[PDB]
Amino acid sequence: ETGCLNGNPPKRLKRRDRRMMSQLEEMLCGGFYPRLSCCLRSNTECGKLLEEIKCALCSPHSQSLFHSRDLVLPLLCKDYCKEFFYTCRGHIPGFLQTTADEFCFYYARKDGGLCFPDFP
Ligand SMILES: O=S(=O)(O)OC[C@H]1O[C@@](COS(=O)(=O)O)(O[C@H]2O[C@H](COS(=O)(=O)O)[C@@H](OS(=O)(=O)O)[C@H](OS(=O)(=O)O)[C@H]2OS(=O)(=O)O)[C@@H](OS(=O)(=O)O)[C@@H]1OS(=O)(=O)O
């Protein structure tokens, strides 16, 4: 069930809509969500991972992902949470004071349902 954080449904990028985007110079997390996005209407290893999590707001399932340290993160997948923790351990402060199992118990989903990354 799709839905955005503002309480409105995601927006579809049609045939006429994509022809405009192709002529403009790429934008609004197109690489992860080109067709259905919530951002349409209203260099290090850790950096790339933070850029992905930044794009979780544009996800057509952003409402389901963000709503269940004071760290605002979407419900991550078991493998990705573990990956993000170790890659951003020296860069994010509180990460060195905890373990991967402890961090992913509160920030990752063990249910087996929808989790971030949405995209493959
Ligand atoms: O032609 S469009 O598909 O681009 O739709 C044009 C505008 O329709 C609204 C409001 O409806 S209206 O008042 O009757 O004009 O929303 C409609 O579109 C979304 C899907 O997004 S999409 O990219 O426009 O296709 C529907 O949501 S959902 O079915 O995917 O859940 C809306 O359904 S609903 O209101 O949530 O029930 C649908 O409305 S309706 O069924 O046609 O009535 C506008 O969206 S709005 O600006 O957020 O109010 C669209 O305007 S827009 O400028 O293209 O954004």
Author numbering: 36 to 60, 66 to 82, 100 to 125, 133 to 184
Task: Show me the paper's own sentences about this structure.
Hedgehog-Interacting Protein (HHIP), the only reported secreted inhibitor of Sonic Hedgehog (SHH) signalling, binds directly to SHH with high nanomolar affinity, sequestering SHH. HHIP is composed of an N-terminal domain (HHIP-N) that shows weak sequence homology to the cysteine-rich domain (CRD) superfamily, typically involved in small molecule-binding. The C-terminal domain of HHIP is composed of a β-propeller and two EGF repeats (HHIP-C). Our data suggest a multimodal mechanism, in which HHIP can bind two specific sites on the SHH morphogen, alongside multiple GAG interactions, to inhibit SHH signalling.
Purified HHIP-N was crystallised in the presence of the GAG mimic sucrose octasulphate (SOS). The structure of the HHIP-N:SOS complex was determined using the single anomalous dispersion (SAD) method from native sulphur atoms. A multi-crystal approach was taken in which 24 data sets were collected from 8 isomorphous crystals, utilising both mini-kappa and inverse beam strategies to maximise the observed anomalous signal. This allowed us to determine the structure of HHIP-N in complex with SOS at a resolution of 2.7 Å, with one molecule in the crystallographic asymmetric unit. HHIP-N possesses an elongated globular fold with a unique N-terminal GAG-binding domain (GBD) and a C-terminal CRD. HHIP-N is stabilised by a total of 6 disulphide bonds. The HHIP-N CRD is composed of 5 helices (α1-α5) stabilised by three intra-CRD disulphide bonds (IV: C103-C152, V: C141-179 and VI: C145-168). Each HHIP-N molecule interacts with 3 SOS molecules. SOS is bound to a positively charged surface localised to the HHIP-N N-terminal domain, forming electrostatic interactions with a cluster of 6 basic residues and burying a total surface area of 594 Å2. Only Arg-47 forms hydrogen bonds with more than one SOS molecule; Arg-51 and Arg-54 are the only residues within the N-terminal α-helical residues 50–58 to contact a SOS molecule. Mutagenesis of SOS-interacting basic HHIP residues (marked with asterisks in Fig. 3d) were previously observed to weaken the interaction between HHIP and heparin, validating our observed HHIP-N:SOS interface.
